[PDB]
Design a binder for this molecule. Structure first.
Ligand code: MET
Length: 245
């Protein structure tokens, strides 16, 4: 019942998922402990410093950028779930209603930029240039822009819900962890939603020396088990999508 495993997480759904599985981990001889973080920097700082043994908040493209930028010696212990990202607006209820020259507000996190670009492409409002590296797409890669949309990417991910609430810009990209915590339902409230979120699975990350840690593996397996995945699916009504790999 008792090897300690300290995991840092976003409040919702991550920390709520972790709390939910504590009794299951206790049966596997692990005492799961959760530290909640409101941003996307401190959970990685905390993992490097040892304040936590693992984190659960980021997807692989974000992880790779963070590793490159900060020389973090971390590893990906496994994907757990997807959060199809939405564009939100109180004023405009469809992308097609957005006036020409409107500004779309997205966070400063460059690894989420391709996601707003794929949403606008799926909607038929933009195309990306021929021979663009789609893996690292930025606003400079836009070719067709039917509504001549402008993009503001200055704000932190944690303040995107504020921009939405204050009605800044025609629409706002909000990561689902933040949107759900503020009472938004991505599958009902978003004016446009990301369709293929597979590359943006949220992972368990650990320091490289703990790559083979058995307790981390127990956690990953419990988090992917059928009974936990069903609970996740029921709790947030499909906005949080469990993955098996
Ligand atoms: C820190 S990378 C973004 C994580 C967020 N929960 C998402 O899947 O969009």
């Amino acid at each position: 019942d008792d090897s300690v495993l300290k995991v840092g997480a976003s409040p919702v759904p991550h920390a709520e998922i972790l709390e939910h599985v504590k009794p299951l981990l206790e049966k596997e001889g692990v005492k799961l402990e959760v530290t909640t973080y409101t941003d996307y920097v401190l959970p990685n700082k905390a993992l490097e410093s040892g304040d936590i043994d693992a984190n659960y908040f980021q997807h692989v493209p974000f992880f790779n950028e963070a590793v490159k930028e900060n020389d973090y010696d971390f590893v990906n212990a496994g994907a757990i779930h997807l959060e199809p990202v939405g564009l939100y607006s109180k004023k405009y209820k469809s992308l097609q209603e957005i006036p020409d020259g409107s500004t779309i507000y997205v966070s400063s996190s460059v690894s989420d930029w391709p996601r707003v670009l794929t949403i606008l492409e799926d909607a038929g409002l933009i195309t990306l240039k021929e021979g663009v590296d789609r893996t690292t797409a930025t606003f400079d890669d836009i070719d067709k822009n039917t509504k001549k949309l402008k993009f503001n990417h200055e704000s932190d991910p944690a303040i995107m819900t504020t921009l939405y609430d204050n009605e800044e810009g025609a629409a706002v990209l909000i990561n689902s962890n933040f949107a759900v915590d503020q009472g938004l339902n991505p599958k009902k409230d978003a004016i446009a939603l990301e369709k293929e979120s597979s590359p943006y699975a949220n992972i368990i990350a650990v320091r490289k020396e703990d790559e083979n840690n058995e307790n981390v593996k127990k956690l990953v397996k419990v988090l992917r088990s059928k009974e936990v995945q069903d609970w996740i699916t029921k709790k947030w009504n499909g906005a949080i999508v469990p993955v098996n790999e």
